[PDB]
Amino acid sequence: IRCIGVSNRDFVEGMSGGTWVDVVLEHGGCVTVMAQDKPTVDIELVTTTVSNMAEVRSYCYEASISDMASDSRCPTQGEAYLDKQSDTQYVCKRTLVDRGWGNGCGLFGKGSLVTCAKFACSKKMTGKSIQPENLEYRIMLSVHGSQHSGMIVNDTGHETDENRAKVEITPNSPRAEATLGGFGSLGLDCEPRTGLDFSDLYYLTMNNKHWLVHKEWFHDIPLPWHAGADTGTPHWNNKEALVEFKDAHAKRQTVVVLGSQEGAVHTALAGALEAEMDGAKGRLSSGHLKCRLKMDKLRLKGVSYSLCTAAFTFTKIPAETLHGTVTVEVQYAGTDGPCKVPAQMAVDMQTLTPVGRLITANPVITESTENSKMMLELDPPFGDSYIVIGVGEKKITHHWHRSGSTIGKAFEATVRGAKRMAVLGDTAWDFGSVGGALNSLGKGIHQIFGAAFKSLFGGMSWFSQILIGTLLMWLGLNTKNGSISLMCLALGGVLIFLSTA
Amino acid sequence: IRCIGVSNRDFVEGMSGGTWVDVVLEHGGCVTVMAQDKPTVDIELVTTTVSNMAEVRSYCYEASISDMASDSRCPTQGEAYLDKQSDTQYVCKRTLVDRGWGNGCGLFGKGSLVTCAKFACSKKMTGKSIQPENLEYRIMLSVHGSQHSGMIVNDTGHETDENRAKVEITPNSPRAEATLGGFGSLGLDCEPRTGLDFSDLYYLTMNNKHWLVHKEWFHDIPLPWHAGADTGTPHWNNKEALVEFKDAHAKRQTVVVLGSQEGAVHTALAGALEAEMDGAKGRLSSGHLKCRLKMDKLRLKGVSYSLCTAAFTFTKIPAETLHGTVTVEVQYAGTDGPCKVPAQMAVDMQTLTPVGRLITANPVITESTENSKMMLELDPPFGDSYIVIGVGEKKITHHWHRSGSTIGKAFEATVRGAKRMAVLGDTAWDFGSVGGALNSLGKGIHQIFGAAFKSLFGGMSWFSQILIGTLLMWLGLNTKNGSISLMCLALGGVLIFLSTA
Amino acid sequence: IRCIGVSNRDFVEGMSGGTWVDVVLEHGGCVTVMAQDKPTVDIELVTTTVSNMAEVRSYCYEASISDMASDSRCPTQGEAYLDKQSDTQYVCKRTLVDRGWGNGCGLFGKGSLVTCAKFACSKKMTGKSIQPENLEYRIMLSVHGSQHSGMIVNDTGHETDENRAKVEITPNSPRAEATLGGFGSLGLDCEPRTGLDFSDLYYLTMNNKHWLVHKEWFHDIPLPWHAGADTGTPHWNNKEALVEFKDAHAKRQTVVVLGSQEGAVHTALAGALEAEMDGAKGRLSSGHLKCRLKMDKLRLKGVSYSLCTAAFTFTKIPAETLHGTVTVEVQYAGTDGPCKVPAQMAVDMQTLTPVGRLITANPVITESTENSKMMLELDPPFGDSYIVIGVGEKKITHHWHRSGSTIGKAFEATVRGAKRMAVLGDTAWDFGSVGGALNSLGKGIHQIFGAAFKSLFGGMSWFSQILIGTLLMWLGLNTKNGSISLMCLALGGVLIFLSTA
Amino acid sequence: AVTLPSHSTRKLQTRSQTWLESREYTKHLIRVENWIFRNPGFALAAAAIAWLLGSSTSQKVIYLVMILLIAPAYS
Amino acid sequence: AVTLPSHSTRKLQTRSQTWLESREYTKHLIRVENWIFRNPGFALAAAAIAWLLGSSTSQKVIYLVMILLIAPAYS
Amino acid sequence: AVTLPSHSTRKLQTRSQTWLESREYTKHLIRVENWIFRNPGFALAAAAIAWLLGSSTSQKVIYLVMILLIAPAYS
């Protein structure tokens, strides 16, 4: 719930003796965390508001040229000079042009010529600096329990919902303990400075469109720029990047401005991430946190509750939620009050063994009214199986066929673990890690390989990875040596890093 | 006369049938031209006034930093900027400083510091351009005849002197004709454009001191310059060559202007001749013309003059004028009028025979007064000889001994044409040339090698020609090959160019 | 604190059982000295005033020729003599010019000419002598303890601040001790005479600009000099380094003075140290001491204090101070009095292991007011770690990410030790030295190499050390003999000596 | 601007889609197939320099590829 | 005079910057770039001596460097 | 201003003596001999490199010269 209709939901289970688990809250996906006798909480990073960014160089992209003039001197009579060359608002260029008796001169040669042109930028883009000390990650939480289908996307009111709570993770106060009344208190222990490398990113602003421009890309743009500490009429360093001084075959020096570089840099922002801005705060839609989930105090609400006596009803016939799990919504018809749903899976009916596990730990009817819509989620085994809900003769079954296999679930998890590893790199070794000599040894051998890849190849685009990935493929099928694994481990580390996208 | 005391006096004779001789009028040297039956004329180049010099870039050598300021910027909070960085009169440098919590900031790291300092140049040097179409070579002439010793240096009155005339050579009308009353007219056919390469030289001006600065050297000076066509407050391109910005360690950047570069550039000239200025015209003290001397119209004054009666008296003892010639000033006593002095050189006084040639062809008394002083010049042979300056028993006979030898004169003229060939080079092959199939073949083989030496080595000082001359000496005493001439041809051609200075 | 924002801060830890550590206080570098049970003191050399310098030769750079005169004699009629030739306030040159009958003389030959010109120096530079008994090294101290962020550069009050002190080290009192109240008393055992070799340095003064000119360079300047403090009109020895006697091809002997040599010597001071002067004392801006720190009288204030009880607050979010250390400012909300701050670095939150050491030994709140700000400094391990400050449940943490590696830090300290060894040489073996058969044998084997490098190469600039490093690089890649570490240790010993500048 | 740097060298790898990702699979592949369609005679010149270099029949194919990728986007 | 010594012979190797440290790197390097741009013909006159003076071709490159360092400074 | 070019390169060759011709013959001899007098130990360092560079007996001699002429000029 809040994660159940998400195509990128992750299932985290198995803990450090039941104490904590270390998760990586990716920004587009979702994390469902389940324990042995603790409620299944659904965790989702929703925004990242970079607050109060200070501006850096602001490049011009659509320039203009105002009242221009030019001056020329005869051959060996010095270099030419306008008095408006002593103005920093005018772009300017000297040249040597043909100067003879027809030009009013008196000596045939290459007479000098200078041409001034008032640079006045009309539209400019602006890069702002992102500090890691201003990240504000909102983490939405939603436990499985007294909730129905209209509480997945619905967020109007959660300070008094008692099943849902947000926590903000600033760097100064990264770890919060969210109040889930009755459900205990989920202790988050986040790591906000190691998100999406925000000490090397800027925040572009072009025509009310904002991007996560990288640091190195922004200081290589050939556009006229002034400093961020420039308030009045700007200075515009590097004015000669948008004016074009073409001479002719005679005295003429024609200056023309290049056009609007707005769309000419939208095609140069070919890897940047679009962002938005609700004032001075840059709301992101991408990144990741790194959260440790202290679940010592989060307890299971409603173990004391008696079972549901009678008369469930299926509303919204169950569906498979892209992973094998089964969203089941029921309508309890009875006034037993805060009671407990007797739901399970079953292969047969002569035994009613629970054959598959249950995602929503302790499904509970809470409303004491007559008809209470209530939602579950189950994890069936692979094959024909029945969703037995209710106790007695008025129990409700549903035939369910979970199409799949265990080796088709393990291969689905290796592909799931590889796309997590090609995005996070070193951090993806700490997604379900309880802390070991293998989840921290294999990370340290990957943090070495991750640093000798970010520097070695590290700048190859999508096409240029496959272009040298194919080359190292051929160097892995030939030139037999001990360095034939160093040509094929740099094959999957290059063609994959690029096809898992 | 006008040349008779100069140590650099040259004797030019031997003509194209008496029509013309071609001479190279060096500016510190003097030329004595004597013919078969034509008066001996002394020819000297005295000035070269360069009119109409329009100025080129004018560098600064003593600057002054006015009211300065500086602005700093926090780490990753932008870039630093002064509002007077948009002012062209301030010299500015951006640098990174240590910024931290002690420096008011809130984020530790390398800050950004911008230091602006108002450039004001107090003293500037000014290079004017020299066009070869504006040269005015003055050729002073002075014939041998009725003149005394008080007309050698005496230039006070020559428009009515009938023995002396100036010849001003512009390239508008290079050929000129000097009216000498009775002596005819020495026709000159000068070459004023191919003098001292004035299209590759400028005219520096520094605290009212002027030089002939080369063109390539003046465009290599690292000093703040305005264009020379700048006639307001100067813009001073390249301000950063006199100021120095130093960061101490911290958020502190000092700016200090370098000192008066007047003495740093006087020691950086050395090879540039210095010229004076009598207005806007820059009078030179050096150069050379290339003057053909058309002597068809120059006739001998007083062939029809009767000889003198008697009573010649010395005014001065005869002296040897540094080349072997003997200058004699006599005093005629009597009123014959325009008469002709009977003087000669007489070995075997009793036979009274001519033995050595006379420099002043046709010595003439002109004034009809009783005592009119008059000056000769004689070229005695190498040995004991007598100077008979009279007719009859009142002749004056002075025993003269010329210290020297024939091979001593041939070695004195070998060094004389080797110093001239080191100074001029190509032009020294036409100093007494009458037009030949060898003196214009020896020049053409020298003009080819001279251009393949002025471009090959061509930029060496005095010391390195003696340094890569000694290196080719060791390649001339070793490396036994056909190119043993070519390493000894550039031994004397480099070492004797380097000394005869 | 006072050193916490400096890029050139150095950490001196590990002592001779807690007795002393021998440190080298460079003048732009800063030093953080810490022990096991002693307060972390930040030790900084700030000034070096040289008092009452008596001067040595004071050269002239801008001279002025007063009323000159000249005299010439005829050839073999005596030599030329002015009555003001035996005056030593005039400069004089004799020559032999062309003197003939046109010059009023009566005998042709080389004359004799003398031109005397009065040398009067208008601006002179003055090189004062630095006696080593005049040095006054101020050593500012600042201990880590009850200080906040506005006590780094804040020097307004240190005699009444009990944390900070100046330690003025004269060689008349070479060891001093600063009473750091509560913390004991830091004892220094400096060597002010073996500093920056001031027997081989002077203190130049050129138009209100001062330098540290080396002794050998100053006695080799070709300028007119006199002996000492002669402020009248001095004798001025070696004048012909500013006047220039050019003759002409005649009686002319033109004497001209070279210009202001201020700029020719500012470009010739290409390695001197720009010093300043506040009166009679020359405040040097660079140098280094050699300081042994006696610490057996320096105790850790506040070990007897109780821990804090409640309510910290992070003011001024922590930051990384260019080395990997983390300066944290807190605001203690509580009137508990002189209590002790419970701070550490913690990876996990159920164990809170001390994983990162603490720079500020014993962080202590001192004031008993309501909100007493206080500043720390922490050295976290590489990776992820939390700044846990406070005990109980009202503690406030902060995520920290220290980017780096242990092998990367060990290279960053090797470069830090090699740059220290290029500046100091012999003294850089005594920066954290506690004495031994390795930190005093390796200094003796380096003082031999330091004497066979300062004398062998020792006089080469930045460019020629690369130019002779590269010449020994190529000898390193050839010449197979035992003399090959002599051409490769003289490769890095010459390149890195002036590439790490 | 002329030489705008490509941000695809430093593309942020963040779970979500970047600014252009849909146009980046056929960005540099349409450009190399548009150029070689315009002047297809260069393949006769590319397979004459590649055949003359290397001389290993697989080293001569990689030079035929790398010349035909440097030639459209000149670099 | 003209023969003032450079202080870069005895630059004070301290922690701070010297007087002209920023103009110390490109000082002689501009001076040999400016000379040989104005005098290109000696680069093939130094090479004609360097190819003639040394024995091995790794010594002839050294003279071609060292003649082109003396001559822009004139020793 | 630290790199004023010498106009002794383009010396105006003529009869009149130039601006500093008297102070030109012993100009470069001083700055070598002033440097060798202050740095005498470099002659050991120049001979130690010339002997490893010189093939012929009089090829190391030119090497001994040209190291002792680049080093006082640093160019």
Side-chain angles (χ1 to χ4, degrees), chain A residues 340-420:
Chain A
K340 179 169 73 176
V341 175
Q344 64 178 353
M345 295 303 296
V347 171
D348 53 355
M349 293 301 170
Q350 295 296 317
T351 319
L352 271 73
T353 51
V355 58
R357 67 183 175 92
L358 182 68
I359 300 298
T360 66
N362 206 163
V364 166
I365 300 295
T366 297
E367 294 292 327
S368 64
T369 64
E370 183 176 359
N371 296 115
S372 298
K373 293 184 287 292
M374 187 268 168
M375 174 181 168
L376 282 86
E377 185 183 4
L378 291 85
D379 180 74
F382 297 104
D384 296 332
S385 59
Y386 290 90
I387 303 171
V388 178
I389 293 174
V391 61
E393 67 178 0
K394 297 183 293 296
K395 64 186 178 183
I396 291 175
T397 66
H398 190 276
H399 189 199
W400 188 258
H401 181 69
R402 181 180 176 180
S403 62
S405 64
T406 302
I407 195 66
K409 185 181 178 180
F411 180 75
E412 187 268 332
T414 301
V415 173
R416 188 68 175 273
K419 293 181 183 291
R420 189 180 298 120

Side-chain angles (χ1 to χ4, degrees), chain A residues 42 48 55 83 206-207 248 254-255 259 280 335 358 371 380 388 402 420:
Chain A
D42 284 334
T48 304
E55 64 269 12
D83 53 353
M206 171 177 285
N207 199 357
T254 303
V255 52
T335 63
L358 182 68
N371 296 115
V388 178
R402 181 180 176 180
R420 189 180 298 120

Side-chain angles (χ1 to χ4, degrees), chain C residues 23-40:
Chain C
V23 81
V24 179
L25 295 175
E26 291 181 355
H27 202 274
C30 292
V31 170
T32 294
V33 174
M34 63 185 75
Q36 293 87 20
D37 292 330
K38 299 179 181 68
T40 305

